[PDB]
Amino acid sequence: QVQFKLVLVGDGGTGKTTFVKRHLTGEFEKKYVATLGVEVHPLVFHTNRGPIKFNVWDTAGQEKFGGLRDGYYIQAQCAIIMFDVTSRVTYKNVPNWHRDLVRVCENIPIVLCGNKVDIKDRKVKAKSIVFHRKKNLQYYDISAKSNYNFEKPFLWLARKLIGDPNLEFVAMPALAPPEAAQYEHDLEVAQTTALPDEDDDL
Amino acid sequence: TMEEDEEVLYKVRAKLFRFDADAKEWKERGTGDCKFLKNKKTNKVRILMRRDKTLKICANHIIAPEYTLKPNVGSDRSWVYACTADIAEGEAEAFTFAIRFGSKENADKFKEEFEKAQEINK
Amino acid sequence: GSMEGILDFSNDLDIALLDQVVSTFYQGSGVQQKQAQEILTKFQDNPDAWQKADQILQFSTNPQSKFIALSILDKLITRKWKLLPNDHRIGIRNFVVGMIISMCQDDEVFKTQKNLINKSDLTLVQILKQEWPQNWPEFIPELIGSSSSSVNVCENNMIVLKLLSEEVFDFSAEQMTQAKALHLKNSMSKEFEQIFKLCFQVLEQGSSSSLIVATLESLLRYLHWIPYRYIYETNILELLSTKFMTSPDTRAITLKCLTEVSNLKDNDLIKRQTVLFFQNTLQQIATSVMPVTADLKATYANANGNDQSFLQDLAMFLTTYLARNRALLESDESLRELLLNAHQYLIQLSKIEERELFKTTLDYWHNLVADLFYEPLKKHIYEEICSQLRLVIIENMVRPVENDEGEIVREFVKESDTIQLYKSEREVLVYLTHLNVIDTEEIMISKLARQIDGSEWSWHNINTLSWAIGSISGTMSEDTEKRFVVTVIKDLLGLCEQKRGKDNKAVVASDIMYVVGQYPRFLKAHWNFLRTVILKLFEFMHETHEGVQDMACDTFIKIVQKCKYHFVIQQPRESEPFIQTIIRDIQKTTADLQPQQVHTFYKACGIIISEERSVAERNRLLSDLMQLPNMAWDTIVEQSTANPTLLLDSETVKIIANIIKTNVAVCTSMGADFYPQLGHIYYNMLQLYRAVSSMISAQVAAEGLIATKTPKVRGLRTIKKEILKLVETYISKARNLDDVVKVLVEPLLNAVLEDYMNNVPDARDAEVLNCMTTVVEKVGHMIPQGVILILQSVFECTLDMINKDFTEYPEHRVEFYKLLKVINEKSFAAFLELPPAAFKLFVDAICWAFKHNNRDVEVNGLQIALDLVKNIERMGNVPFANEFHKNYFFIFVSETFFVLTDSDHKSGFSKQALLLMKLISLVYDNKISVPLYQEAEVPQGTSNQVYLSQYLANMLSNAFPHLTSEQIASFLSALTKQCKDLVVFKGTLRDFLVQIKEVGGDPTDYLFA
Ligand SMILES: Nc1nc2c(ncn2[C@@H]2O[C@H](COP(=O)(O)OP(=O)(O)NP(=O)(O)O)[C@@H](O)[C@H]2O)c(=O)[nH]1
Ligand SMILES: O=C(CCn1cnc(-c2cc(C(F)(F)F)cc(C(F)(F)F)c2)n1)NNc1cnccn1
Ligand SMILES: [Mg+2]
């Protein structure tokens, strides 16, 4: 099986776990429950070069919850460094995270992501984001909330890891699908629980 | 893709939710094109829906005639229904789905197409 | 479980069991991996786990186990080193040193366990930060001597020195006190001449590529700080720019080294060497890597080996050097080929498809063309470069936000990430156009002719060209612009009459709309053509074309914002000002638009009407414009004034919301001129607000809180929110404040305040607070009793909503503190009127705001406290100010200290420090009149300065008991002395934040200033 260890680092509350959960289940988690150490999630994308599986090590950004810290980076084959464009301090800390990461992983593809561009009051201005240049990191504006560019970090990493610049995500095969006591209860509860974000476009 | 011997009866942009009964909250499962697909060999109509930009399947189940579209208290542009065999994520699993559209008119169009597909499947 | 045995420290540590849990964590999966993770973290967190590090590093079979042991040592060294007995310090040192030595003498271990060796080197560096040089003076001389005994030791000593340099010069500012940073920097500086000796001899002598790379990696770090003589008075620049450019293993790091040299700090010899290493470097690229004609776009796209990173690094080197030094290349005719060849590589790099790399080259081009714009006699040097650059930018123009069609000739989401790139492309292209307007026009006209009668027709050939044409508007003087635009428009009109189909039409229509929208000066001078454009946009408002219809609305208001005057005057050969023609047809013109687009249309009409300064004529135009919504309004207030059930018609709720949204739109652009229309609806509008509010409360009562999520109640609350938005919008722009106070404010407060107060929390609209903020902001000084009523109705009930967690009711949270801020600013007397219990809640609410991580709340809370301290100080020596200080001075001091030190509110450091400095300075200026202590507590006549120091010493002693008394006293003495110099004050606070993270911080550190 083709599988790659990916470490995700960044200040607490930048949206690392929300971003991964979006890719895992499609959900958007509004609550902030801080990661305790690391959570490991397998994540598969289908490409024209076959399936690619990322073992995503979603590490804690809060220092008091940091766990093994750089011990998580051992044998990572790629990485995402996350910050929050509404919080300047999280960009200020990007060189520290990068420092600790490349001391363990000296030659891996790394994506820098500025998350939460859906928020109107942006604080880390586009023109300010230059740290990736001397460090050969790929950069993307992203929003786990709006899905803006949300596929880009994984598409770029897969291209670098497979060694194919023409790699593309492709549509999964769609098998033909198969052809009342607890149900009326659950349906009632579901009808009477309001859908979230009723003001969104969808 | 396994969609080559199927005809596109209906397509609409939508957002799909799944009900987490334990957490008592709706969770998004995917945003993209919801398609009603009729199999040229069996004449059976399925819902098949894929996420934008990852193209991952978030709905794959027969539009069974036993299903009923019901309103959600918070929306005039959504439908709720119980699905007993969705294979988007592997083995067939039962879900309570909600699907929301860009407008009430799209939601009402989805409903009549959903019911017509149910008659085809008979 | 079996794996938790390693957590029992009474028994000896089973190293085999440790290794199994570690392997389970790294190479396992699922539940077992998660269990092992939690065990390993508990093991690492054990405060005596370090005592087992030697046993793991000696007996373990698993390098990850040894890594984890080294992480445990790192925490001990960095946080508790000076608490250890001296024998344990020496033992840890000798033990780390000897482990590094043995890994480097074993060729097999040195080659396979780089991860563990690097972590060991960094661990040693942590020891150095604690022990060197004062308790290790011979470290550098011994390192240098041991280097010549083994290639492996020598190479690893370069890694240690690299890490030490990073820790001392690159990452010290936030991890060490100012004093300790200076000590370690001075120490490295005093011994660098020896270090450089070894580094230069390795580079000139060595052949081991791995040793050379490591030496060069360490040199990269040194270049951040070493004196320039080490770089220019040696032969090292020749080695970097020739030898180490030829081999690809050293080329990457050498190029990065030469980029930093292009940043080191009248000497004609130095200029010659700066020219020379550049010439050497470019010669090596041309002969060893690729010639200047090479297709780097293709090479990058292929992405072989490290080609992408090398091209990135080459762009950085060339842009960095040329931005600083191209003047050295510009006068000497013998250097002209070098100057242009370097810029030709940059042209080739600018053709690569890589957004972030393009921004890097574009930044350089901006730097260049802005210098050619001003510097005499320079632009002619770069004529051919600039001509090629015009082509590159015109062909890589990104979408200009206003263009709403894409891909399949459809609409979407906004391309948020391209806004800045377009602006940067526009900036350079505008400069390039000024540099040679003939060349730019010739290029654009020619591309355009080959769109029509040419082999180049496509989308993104018409698109990127149309966007470039629009983007240069203003670069030509008016007469040249006139001829250019006439040519472009005819030819775009040619393309649209002949390309047919949904897709073609949408593409060309968007391009024409963008261009004409970008040339309002041309429109102002040709009224007859402006008319035809406006009428064409009205046609497009009936387009089934998704995309085109929305863009026509945006283009209409974009044009009106610039050309409004020509709609308000009466044009020659017209029967009427054109604003009249628009208004008379507004039902038909907008008939097929969506409501938000209708409101945009009305907003644009209001822009035009406000140009009319004859008040009688303006008000008549406003009445004419609002004729349809007012007649709908009159009818609906007639119907729903007898059947509050009809107000439960969803259709009727949408109509009302849209009527008010229309008023909001016109008010936005008309501002103070909107008042006559506001007065037409005001009384009935507030009656409707009350009626709608009764319905919402009734629905919540009959259906439960869930009713607030239903479409009906959301629609009813939309009415209330838009009514609040309309009033806020007018009052924020009002010029006659007397009418605001005497006509608007009393009915508004009657309508909204008790409804807010008397609704359940989930039914309260945060927009009430937002409206009240503007009310207070504009006329608060004229309504002191009205501000009191606002506080009475919203203060305590909103505070109770938001004071149980930091997450619930986030909008109420943000608007709450904006309201308190403006009241504290503008009508502070209102807080003086509060009963003591409520004033105590006010202080609680302010400190509560402190503890938010939400910047939208934290910043206002810190500001409120500062303004409040100032408000109190302005009162002078009066009973209320004396009581305030006795009750709340130390509450503000301690709460401010708490968020300064808890590591969870670093985003507010600067304003926390400002507030703390203000508080302390109050006492050391004796601006507080009464004793801050109780009569018992301390001797009579004890100064508040003495008591404050006493209070703070006690506070910090109990909050940070690992500090020594002398650390605390030295800290406070420095802090107090510095309460008039914010930058020094802040450095002392930062020194304190470092010291509380460890044991045994030097109290003399606080003398740094
Ligand atoms: N508006 C917005 N909110 C987001 C976005 N992404 C994440 N969030 C929100 O930010 C908060 C933090 O979520 P989380 O994923 O736990 O961040 P984290 O980096 O994992 N924190 P930690 O490192 O401590 O575990 C959540 O409330 C989440 O809803 C986003 O893209 N937009
Ligand atoms: O005839 C055209 C020509 C195509 N065409 C596209 N766009 C345009 C166009 C757009 C603008 C706008 F303001 F919108 F930017 C202004 C102007 C003009 F210069 F005339 F003032 C023209 N013309 N289109 N419509 C129809 C209708 N029936 C049959 C065929 N085509
Ligand atoms: Mg997390």
Short mmCIF file of N, CA, C and O in Angstrom, two decimals, chain C residues 835-914:
data_model
loop_
_atom_site.label_atom_id
_atom_site.label_comp_id
_atom_site.label_asym_id
_atom_site.label_seq_id
_atom_site.Cartn_x
_atom_site.Cartn_y
_atom_site.Cartn_z
N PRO C 835 -25.39 52.17 40.36
CA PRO C 835 -25.25 51.74 41.75
C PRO C 835 -23.96 50.96 41.93
O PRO C 835 -23.47 50.32 40.99
N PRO C 836 -23.38 51.00 43.14
CA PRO C 836 -22.09 50.32 43.36
C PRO C 836 -22.06 48.87 42.90
O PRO C 836 -21.04 48.43 42.35
N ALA C 837 -23.15 48.12 43.10
CA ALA C 837 -23.18 46.74 42.65
C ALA C 837 -23.00 46.65 41.14
O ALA C 837 -22.25 45.80 40.64
N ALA C 838 -23.68 47.52 40.39
CA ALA C 838 -23.56 47.49 38.93
C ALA C 838 -22.19 47.95 38.47
O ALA C 838 -21.64 47.40 37.51
N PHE C 839 -21.62 48.97 39.12
CA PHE C 839 -20.27 49.38 38.77
C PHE C 839 -19.27 48.25 39.01
O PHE C 839 -18.29 48.12 38.26
N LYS C 840 -19.51 47.42 40.02
CA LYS C 840 -18.66 46.25 40.23
C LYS C 840 -18.79 45.26 39.08
O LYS C 840 -17.81 44.64 38.67
N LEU C 841 -20.01 45.10 38.55
CA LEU C 841 -20.17 44.25 37.36
C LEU C 841 -19.45 44.85 36.17
O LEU C 841 -18.91 44.11 35.33
N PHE C 842 -19.42 46.18 36.07
CA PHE C 842 -18.69 46.84 34.99
C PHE C 842 -17.21 46.46 35.02
O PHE C 842 -16.63 46.07 34.00
N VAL C 843 -16.59 46.56 36.20
CA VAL C 843 -15.18 46.17 36.34
C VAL C 843 -15.01 44.69 36.02
O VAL C 843 -14.07 44.30 35.31
N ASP C 844 -15.92 43.85 36.52
CA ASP C 844 -15.87 42.42 36.21
C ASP C 844 -15.92 42.19 34.70
O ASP C 844 -15.15 41.39 34.16
N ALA C 845 -16.83 42.89 34.01
CA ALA C 845 -16.97 42.71 32.57
C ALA C 845 -15.70 43.10 31.83
O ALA C 845 -15.30 42.44 30.86
N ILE C 846 -15.04 44.18 32.27
CA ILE C 846 -13.80 44.61 31.63
C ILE C 846 -12.72 43.55 31.78
O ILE C 846 -12.05 43.17 30.80
N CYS C 847 -12.51 43.06 33.00
CA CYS C 847 -11.49 42.03 33.23
C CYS C 847 -11.86 40.73 32.52
O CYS C 847 -10.98 40.01 32.04
N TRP C 848 -13.15 40.42 32.47
CA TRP C 848 -13.62 39.29 31.67
C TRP C 848 -13.18 39.42 30.22
O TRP C 848 -12.70 38.46 29.61
N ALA C 849 -13.33 40.63 29.66
CA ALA C 849 -12.88 40.87 28.29
C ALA C 849 -11.39 40.58 28.13
O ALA C 849 -10.97 40.04 27.10
N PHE C 850 -10.58 40.93 29.14
CA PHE C 850 -9.14 40.63 29.12
C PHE C 850 -8.89 39.18 28.74
O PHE C 850 -8.01 38.88 27.92
N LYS C 851 -9.60 38.27 29.39
CA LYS C 851 -9.29 36.85 29.33
C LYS C 851 -9.75 36.20 28.05
O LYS C 851 -9.47 35.02 27.84
N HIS C 852 -10.47 36.93 27.20
CA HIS C 852 -10.82 36.40 25.89
C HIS C 852 -9.56 36.21 25.05
O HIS C 852 -8.63 37.02 25.10
N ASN C 853 -9.52 35.11 24.31
CA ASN C 853 -8.55 34.98 23.25
C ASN C 853 -9.03 35.64 21.97
O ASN C 853 -8.22 35.98 21.11
N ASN C 854 -10.35 35.81 21.85
CA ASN C 854 -11.01 36.56 20.78
C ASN C 854 -10.48 37.99 20.70
O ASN C 854 -10.81 38.83 21.55
N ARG C 855 -9.67 38.27 19.68
CA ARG C 855 -9.10 39.60 19.51
C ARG C 855 -10.17 40.68 19.46
O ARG C 855 -9.97 41.80 19.95
N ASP C 856 -11.33 40.36 18.86
CA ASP C 856 -12.43 41.32 18.75
C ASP C 856 -13.00 41.73 20.10
O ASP C 856 -13.74 42.72 20.16
N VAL C 857 -12.69 41.00 21.17
CA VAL C 857 -13.13 41.35 22.51
C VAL C 857 -11.96 41.81 23.37
O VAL C 857 -12.07 42.81 24.09
N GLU C 858 -10.83 41.10 23.29
CA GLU C 858 -9.67 41.40 24.12
C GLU C 858 -9.21 42.84 23.95
O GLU C 858 -8.93 43.54 24.93
N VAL C 859 -9.13 43.31 22.70
CA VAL C 859 -8.57 44.63 22.43
C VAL C 859 -9.46 45.72 23.01
O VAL C 859 -8.97 46.70 23.59
N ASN C 860 -10.78 45.59 22.85
CA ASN C 860 -11.68 46.58 23.42
C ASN C 860 -11.64 46.56 24.94
O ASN C 860 -11.69 47.61 25.59
N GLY C 861 -11.54 45.37 25.54
CA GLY C 861 -11.47 45.28 26.99
C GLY C 861 -10.24 45.97 27.55
O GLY C 861 -10.34 46.75 28.51
N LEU C 862 -9.08 45.71 26.95
CA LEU C 862 -7.87 46.42 27.35
C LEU C 862 -8.01 47.92 27.14
O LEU C 862 -7.59 48.71 27.99
N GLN C 863 -8.63 48.33 26.03
CA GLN C 863 -8.82 49.75 25.79
C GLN C 863 -9.78 50.36 26.80
O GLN C 863 -9.54 51.47 27.30
N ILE C 864 -10.87 49.65 27.13
CA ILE C 864 -11.82 50.17 28.11
C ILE C 864 -11.12 50.42 29.43
O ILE C 864 -11.31 51.47 30.06
N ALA C 865 -10.29 49.47 29.88
CA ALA C 865 -9.60 49.62 31.16
C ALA C 865 -8.68 50.83 31.14
O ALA C 865 -8.64 51.60 32.10
N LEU C 866 -7.94 51.02 30.05
CA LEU C 866 -7.07 52.18 29.92
C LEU C 866 -7.87 53.47 29.96
O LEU C 866 -7.54 54.40 30.71
N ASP C 867 -8.93 53.56 29.14
CA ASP C 867 -9.79 54.74 29.16
C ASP C 867 -10.42 54.96 30.53
O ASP C 867 -10.61 56.10 30.96
N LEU C 868 -10.78 53.87 31.22
CA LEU C 868 -11.41 54.00 32.53
C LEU C 868 -10.43 54.56 33.55
O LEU C 868 -10.76 55.49 34.29
N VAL C 869 -9.22 53.99 33.61
CA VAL C 869 -8.17 54.54 34.45
C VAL C 869 -7.98 56.02 34.16
O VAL C 869 -7.87 56.85 35.08
N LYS C 870 -7.98 56.39 32.88
CA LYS C 870 -7.85 57.80 32.53
C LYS C 870 -9.08 58.59 32.97
O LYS C 870 -8.94 59.70 33.50
N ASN C 871 -10.28 58.05 32.74
CA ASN C 871 -11.49 58.72 33.20
C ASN C 871 -11.43 59.02 34.69
O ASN C 871 -11.77 60.12 35.13
N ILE C 872 -10.98 58.05 35.49
CA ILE C 872 -10.88 58.24 36.93
C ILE C 872 -9.84 59.30 37.27
O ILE C 872 -10.08 60.17 38.11
N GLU C 873 -8.69 59.25 36.60
CA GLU C 873 -7.63 60.22 36.87
C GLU C 873 -8.09 61.64 36.59
O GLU C 873 -7.76 62.57 37.34
N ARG C 874 -8.88 61.84 35.52
CA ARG C 874 -9.39 63.16 35.20
C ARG C 874 -10.29 63.73 36.29
O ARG C 874 -10.47 64.95 36.36
N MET C 875 -10.87 62.87 37.14
CA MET C 875 -11.75 63.37 38.19
C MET C 875 -10.97 64.10 39.28
O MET C 875 -11.54 64.95 39.97
N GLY C 876 -9.69 63.77 39.46
CA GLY C 876 -8.92 64.38 40.52
C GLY C 876 -9.19 63.73 41.86
O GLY C 876 -9.71 62.61 41.97
N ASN C 877 -8.84 64.46 42.92
CA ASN C 877 -8.95 63.96 44.29
C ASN C 877 -10.38 64.20 44.79
O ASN C 877 -10.68 65.14 45.52
N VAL C 878 -11.27 63.30 44.37
CA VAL C 878 -12.67 63.36 44.79
C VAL C 878 -13.07 62.00 45.33
O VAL C 878 -12.42 60.98 45.03
N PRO C 879 -14.14 61.94 46.14
CA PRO C 879 -14.52 60.65 46.76
C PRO C 879 -14.66 59.48 45.79
O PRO C 879 -14.23 58.37 46.12
N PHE C 880 -15.26 59.69 44.61
CA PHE C 880 -15.45 58.56 43.71
C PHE C 880 -14.12 58.01 43.21
O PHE C 880 -13.93 56.79 43.15
N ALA C 881 -13.18 58.89 42.87
CA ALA C 881 -11.87 58.43 42.40
C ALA C 881 -11.10 57.75 43.53
O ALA C 881 -10.43 56.73 43.30
N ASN C 882 -11.18 58.29 44.74
CA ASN C 882 -10.51 57.65 45.88
C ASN C 882 -11.09 56.27 46.14
O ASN C 882 -10.34 55.31 46.38
N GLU C 883 -12.42 56.14 46.11
CA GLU C 883 -13.05 54.84 46.32
C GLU C 883 -12.72 53.87 45.19
O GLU C 883 -12.49 52.68 45.43
N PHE C 884 -12.70 54.37 43.95
CA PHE C 884 -12.34 53.51 42.82
C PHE C 884 -10.98 52.85 43.06
O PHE C 884 -10.83 51.64 42.90
N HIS C 885 -9.99 53.66 43.44
CA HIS C 885 -8.64 53.13 43.61
C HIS C 885 -8.59 52.11 44.75
O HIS C 885 -8.00 51.04 44.60
N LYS C 886 -9.22 52.43 45.88
CA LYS C 886 -9.24 51.50 47.00
C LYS C 886 -9.93 50.20 46.63
O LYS C 886 -9.53 49.12 47.10
N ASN C 887 -10.96 50.27 45.79
CA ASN C 887 -11.73 49.08 45.46
C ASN C 887 -11.13 48.27 44.32
O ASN C 887 -11.22 47.04 44.32
N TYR C 888 -10.52 48.93 43.33
CA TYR C 888 -10.23 48.27 42.07
C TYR C 888 -8.82 48.45 41.52
O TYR C 888 -8.50 47.82 40.50
N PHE C 889 -7.96 49.27 42.13
CA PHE C 889 -6.61 49.43 41.59
C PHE C 889 -5.88 48.09 41.55
O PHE C 889 -5.37 47.69 40.50
N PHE C 890 -5.84 47.39 42.67
CA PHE C 890 -5.11 46.13 42.71
C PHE C 890 -5.81 45.03 41.93
O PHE C 890 -5.14 44.10 41.46
N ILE C 891 -7.13 45.12 41.76
CA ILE C 891 -7.82 44.19 40.87
C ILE C 891 -7.33 44.37 39.44
O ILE C 891 -7.02 43.40 38.74
N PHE C 892 -7.20 45.62 38.99
CA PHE C 892 -6.71 45.84 37.63
C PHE C 892 -5.24 45.46 37.50
O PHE C 892 -4.82 44.93 36.46
N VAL C 893 -4.43 45.70 38.54
CA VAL C 893 -3.02 45.34 38.47
C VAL C 893 -2.85 43.83 38.37
O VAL C 893 -2.09 43.32 37.54
N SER C 894 -3.55 43.09 39.23
CA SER C 894 -3.36 41.64 39.26
C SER C 894 -3.98 40.97 38.03
O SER C 894 -3.37 40.07 37.45
N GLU C 895 -5.18 41.40 37.63
CA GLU C 895 -5.78 40.84 36.42
C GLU C 895 -4.92 41.09 35.19
O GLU C 895 -4.78 40.22 34.33
N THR C 896 -4.32 42.28 35.11
CA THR C 896 -3.42 42.56 33.99
C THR C 896 -2.18 41.68 34.05
O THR C 896 -1.76 41.12 33.03
N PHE C 897 -1.60 41.52 35.24
CA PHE C 897 -0.46 40.61 35.40
C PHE C 897 -0.83 39.18 35.05
O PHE C 897 0.00 38.43 34.51
N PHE C 898 -2.06 38.76 35.35
CA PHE C 898 -2.44 37.38 35.09
C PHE C 898 -2.45 37.07 33.59
O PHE C 898 -1.95 36.02 33.17
N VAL C 899 -3.02 37.96 32.78
CA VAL C 899 -3.05 37.67 31.35
C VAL C 899 -1.69 37.91 30.72
O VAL C 899 -1.39 37.33 29.67
N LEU C 900 -0.85 38.75 31.33
CA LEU C 900 0.51 38.92 30.82
C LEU C 900 1.34 37.64 30.95
O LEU C 900 2.19 37.37 30.10
N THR C 901 1.10 36.84 32.00
CA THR C 901 1.99 35.74 32.35
C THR C 901 1.46 34.35 32.05
O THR C 901 2.19 33.38 32.25
N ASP C 902 0.21 34.20 31.60
CA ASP C 902 -0.36 32.86 31.55
C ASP C 902 -0.12 32.14 30.23
O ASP C 902 -0.61 31.02 30.06
N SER C 903 0.62 32.75 29.29
CA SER C 903 0.99 32.18 28.00
C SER C 903 -0.20 31.92 27.08
O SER C 903 -0.04 31.30 26.03
N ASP C 904 -1.39 32.40 27.44
CA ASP C 904 -2.57 32.17 26.62
C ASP C 904 -3.13 33.45 26.01
O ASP C 904 -4.16 33.40 25.33
N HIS C 905 -2.47 34.59 26.21
CA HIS C 905 -2.96 35.88 25.72
C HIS C 905 -1.82 36.71 25.16
O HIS C 905 -1.76 37.93 25.36
N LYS C 906 -0.90 36.06 24.44
CA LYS C 906 0.26 36.78 23.92
C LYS C 906 -0.12 37.82 22.88
O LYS C 906 0.63 38.79 22.70
N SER C 907 -1.28 37.69 22.23
CA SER C 907 -1.68 38.65 21.21
C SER C 907 -1.94 40.05 21.78
O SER C 907 -1.86 41.03 21.04
N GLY C 908 -2.24 40.16 23.07
CA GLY C 908 -2.49 41.44 23.70
C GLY C 908 -1.32 42.03 24.46
O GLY C 908 -1.52 43.01 25.19
N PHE C 909 -0.12 41.48 24.30
CA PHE C 909 1.02 41.86 25.14
C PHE C 909 1.22 43.37 25.18
O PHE C 909 1.39 43.96 26.25
N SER C 910 1.20 44.02 24.01
CA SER C 910 1.54 45.43 23.94
C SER C 910 0.56 46.29 24.72
O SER C 910 0.96 47.21 25.44
N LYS C 911 -0.74 46.02 24.60
CA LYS C 911 -1.70 46.85 25.32
C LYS C 911 -1.87 46.41 26.77
O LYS C 911 -2.18 47.25 27.62
N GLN C 912 -1.64 45.13 27.08
CA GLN C 912 -1.49 44.74 28.48
C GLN C 912 -0.35 45.51 29.13
O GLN C 912 -0.50 46.05 30.24
N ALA C 913 0.80 45.57 28.46
CA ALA C 913 1.95 46.27 29.02
C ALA C 913 1.66 47.76 29.18
O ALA C 913 2.05 48.37 30.18
N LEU C 914 0.99 48.35 28.19
CA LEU C 914 0.59 49.76 28.29
C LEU C 914 -0.28 49.99 29.51
O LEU C 914 -0.07 50.94 30.28
#
